[PDB]
Amino acid sequence: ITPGICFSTASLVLRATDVHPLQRIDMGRFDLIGLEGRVSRYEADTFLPRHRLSRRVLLEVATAPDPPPRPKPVKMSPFYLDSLEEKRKRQRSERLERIFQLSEAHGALAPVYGTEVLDFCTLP
């Protein structure tokens, strides 16, 4: 029994391939092989084109008050600041825009084959 070889290298070498997130684009928008076994043809072709969110619907849901509580089953301003509120509402608008853009981005791609086709073509 021998001790292993301890190979010492510069700490900078281990970060050679690393790229900061602010310096790289999202490669998940071209991920076709990741959709196989997870995304179905129904989702890509029939559901998402009909039930995609819109900016109007998102804004309406965000601005509207909380829904009433679900019924139980039955067996049958001195300290107000204008600048702070303007900043907060701008932040809320930006958050809603980000939610919309991300929801559109995460369902844009359709599978090459899809779960239904693969299941049909897969013999026991």
Binding site: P21, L22, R24, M27, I33, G34
Partner: protein, 121 residues
């Protein structure tokens, strides 16, 4: 990006994750998608660690401990990193060139995957 000052999952399963990130320019409270909690737990993120979170993907990287806690022990095997200087929320508009071969090789083999076949691959 910033030092983690609070990490509180909100139970209804987990409805959302409330995180507190600190920078030199202030503190920001963020509501996280519950899927990011798995990434936070895998990375072993605790209070006082300097992390960044990608808004579009939810990726979390714990890039060391804050140097304000460097004296909490006399001998720990930790990498202590300065507190980030800018704002917690950083926006940059970038233009990156990729080639068709990059997308081909990116779609030739799967990435990640918690299955046994993926791990052995």
């Amino acid at each position: 990006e910033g030092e983690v000052t609070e990490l509180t999952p909100c139970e209804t399963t987990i409805s959302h994750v409330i995180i507190g990130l600190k920078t030199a320019k202030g503190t920001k409270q963020l509501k996280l998608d519950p899927s990011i909690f798995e990434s936070l737990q895998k990375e072993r993120v605790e209070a006082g660690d300097v992390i960044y979170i990608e808004a579009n993907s939810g990726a979390v990287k714990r890039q060391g401990r804050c140097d304000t806690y460097a004296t909490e022990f006399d001998l720990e095997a930790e990498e202590y990193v300065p507190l980030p200087k800018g704002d917690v929320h950083k926006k940059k508009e970038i233009i990156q060139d990729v080639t068709l071969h990059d997308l081909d090789v990116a779609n030739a083999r799967p990435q990640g995957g918690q299955d046994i076949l993926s791990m052995m691959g």
